[PDB]
Design an enzyme around this catalytic site. Sequence first.
Site, PDB file in Angstrom:
ATOM      1  N   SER C 366       0.892  -1.125   0.000  1.00  0.00           N
ATOM      2  CA  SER C 366       0.000   0.000   0.000  1.00  0.00           C
ATOM      3  C   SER C 366       0.921   1.161   0.000  1.00  0.00           C
ATOM      4  O   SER C 366       1.800   1.246   0.849  1.00  0.00           O
ATOM      5  N   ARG C 367       0.760   2.079  -0.965  1.00  0.00           N
ATOM      6  CA  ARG C 367       1.668   3.179  -1.099  1.00  0.00           C
ATOM      7  C   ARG C 367       1.129   4.392  -0.417  1.00  0.00           C
ATOM      8  O   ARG C 367       1.849   5.372  -0.294  1.00  0.00           O
TER       9      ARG C 367
END
Lengths: 50, 58, 499
Positions: C366-367
């Site tokens: 998850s950025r």
Amino acid sequence: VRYEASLRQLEQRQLAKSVISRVQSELGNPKFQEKVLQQSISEIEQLLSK
Amino acid sequence: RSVLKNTSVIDKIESYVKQYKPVKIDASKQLQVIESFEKHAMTNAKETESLVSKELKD
Amino acid sequence: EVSSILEERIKGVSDEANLNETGRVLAVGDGIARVFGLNNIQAEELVEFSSGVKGMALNLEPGQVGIVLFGSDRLVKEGELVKRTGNIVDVPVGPGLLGRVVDALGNPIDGKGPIDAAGRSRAQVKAPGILPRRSVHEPVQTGLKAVDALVPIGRGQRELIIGDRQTGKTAVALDTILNQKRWNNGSDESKKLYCVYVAVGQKRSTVAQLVQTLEQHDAMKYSIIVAATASEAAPLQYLAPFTAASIGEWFRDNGKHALIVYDDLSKQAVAYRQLSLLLRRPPGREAYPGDVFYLHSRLLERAAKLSEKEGSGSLTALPVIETQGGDVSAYIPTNVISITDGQIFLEAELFYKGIRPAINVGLSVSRVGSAAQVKALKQVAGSLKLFLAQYREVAAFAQSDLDASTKQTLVRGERLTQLLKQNQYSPLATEEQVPLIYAGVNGHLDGIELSRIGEFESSFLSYLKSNHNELLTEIREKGELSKELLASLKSATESFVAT
């Protein structure tokens, strides 16, 4: 409720195919001729109105 | 009801539901068994309590 | 009744007026009619044939304007008036589309009467700029325990759902839609995510199943499903995500929240290939249309999280990409992976191994990460990320005479992995995600044997509901776990584990 809605749909397609039967009758008539006159004057009215 | 357009059955089942609105009658059966159970339990409980209290001081 | 409606309809069609521009098809082949005429034609404008098929005019060529037919070839036949509709592709958008299954054009295909809509907005409009966008800051809880802890998803940031072919990719997505019911039902209008699911290139039977499933979980009432099915012509399939984005814009612009899940962009790509190659536009890498990176990038960047200046709206997006044999080096996956801002990588092996949802914990990222995740859930599951990491590394050592330390990891790790399974097509409230995860994290369930982990899970929930639904309600509403709350929780878990 479900069948009531289904019955309405059934009515809509039934009266639709009956409309097709009336259309085949309409295109036979020399209304086919007489409405060309109506179109003729309508196009005259339209194109002059531009 | 206002959805249905076949309405002559909504009055039927509305009134049938509201008629039979009691769908089950009450049960209170814990008033004969609970008191009997409570008597034996209370007796035994008190017996134990008094017995061990006595023994503690002994 | 129906007769009255038809009578209204005949009355409701009126005589026309002189219609500017006309064409005559020069040659129509391959669903690419090429019309000679149409002197002034706006690029990409919708043009309507004599037959009644609609088309758009992707190539305006120097002497002929190459319309692409939105229906069967048979409809258009060489030389025939080609009327100019005169409005570039636009679809009805509005609050009123809520609960209707509509096709790419926007026509009701659900058959629940005319689509009442508040605007028609163009289907190619450019994405929110640098100054309009304000960084993500509101969690979106998908309700799957694994997604919500391992890979947080926040409002307004696209995250891919890239995974192996027919490993029930769609299921992972559909689960997200169901969980949004919990927030949706209420009255807090800064909580409702109004989802729109865009079924592109899926058989009509599959989309019928989708419709029924949504109705079954009583979820059509915040869903709009733009469906352009496999049968539908290749232009309709092409315009299907673009159209969908426009449906989303009403939500974003009017300041609601919404999540549009494009399923699956892999098939979107195939449709663009079909159009381009048939229009003889230059071929390119892996025989995919030349500007294919550009096409996908346009679609996916319409998602954004608007600034407080611009009404604080959002438009979360979740494209689904089908990886053919899991080869994530393939040109259409690679392009999309770059464009997106996160990945969830569903792995076929895991699916087979009974971990469903089958999120491969390692290869998902998850950025936007910690901006999302409910504050409570963040606190009690920072640990969860780290524990699983060790379990992965020490996984292969499960083939003897193993250190006590190694064995401790293995026990904790196996139990956690078993714990994170979620029964298909049922979401789980956030207020129960924080308790369940707490138990594993604090190692209470380490002792519980693997076969009983599942039984424990359901039991813990019922136990929490009976013993202290005060605790649960506090967890839900406070939304942040104070030391006192964590104290109460420790006790509760101790009590539960003891029984």
